């Protein structure tokens, strides 16, 4: 099953386009789609809230394939040092995203799937119990996806 244009699910394409259009009007295709979209938005919001500072911070990390995991691990353990909230979770996502773009920028593309895998492991191992206890991703949707920032 080599991936390509002819293995590409038409359903998946449609669902993804419709989720987008629905969300632009404050609607959603499904809870999964609403979680994804609220995450994208929260991410943008987080990155734009300290546009320069967030960028200047991530830029301070000088990633190479040989140092990437140890830097990832220190930042994330510290980020959740004294607990979890949805804000930190958004920051966790945005940080991983920044790391991926920088990896590609420096021709370190191999790091993209490793980062994604380190993120998934951290989520499923560390974060999932907290998320589940706190009423699931449905709580994030309600809090962030269905509310605007106080200001």
């Amino acid at each position: 099953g080599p991936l390509g244009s002819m293995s590409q699910s038409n359903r998946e394409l449609v669902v993804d386009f419709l989720s987008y259009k629905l969300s632009q009007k404050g609607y959603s295709w499904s809870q999964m789609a609403a979680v994804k979209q609220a995450l994208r938005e929260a991410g943008d919001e987080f990155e734009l809230r300290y546009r320069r500072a967030f960028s200047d911070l991530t830029s301070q990390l000088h990633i190479t394939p040989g140092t990437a995991y140890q830097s990832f691990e220190q930042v994330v353990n510290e980020l959740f040092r004294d607990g979890v909230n949805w804000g930190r979770i958004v920051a966790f996502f945005s940080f991983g995203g920044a790391l991926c773009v920088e990896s590609v920028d420096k021709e370190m593309q191999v790091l993209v799937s490793r980062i994604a895998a380190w993120m998934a492991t951290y989520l499923n191992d560390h974060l999932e119990p907290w998320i589940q206890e706190n009423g699931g991703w449905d709580t994030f949707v309600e809090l962030y996806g269905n509310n605007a920032a106080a200001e």
Partner: peptide
């Protein structure tokens, strides 16, 4: 270091979270 960038993400995250929660 990576811990004191981690602690000043956690600045940004809590002062986003204190917008929402």
């Amino acid at each position: 270091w990576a811990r004191e960038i981690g602690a000043x993400l956690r600045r940004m995250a809590d002062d986003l979270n204190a917008q929402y929660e």
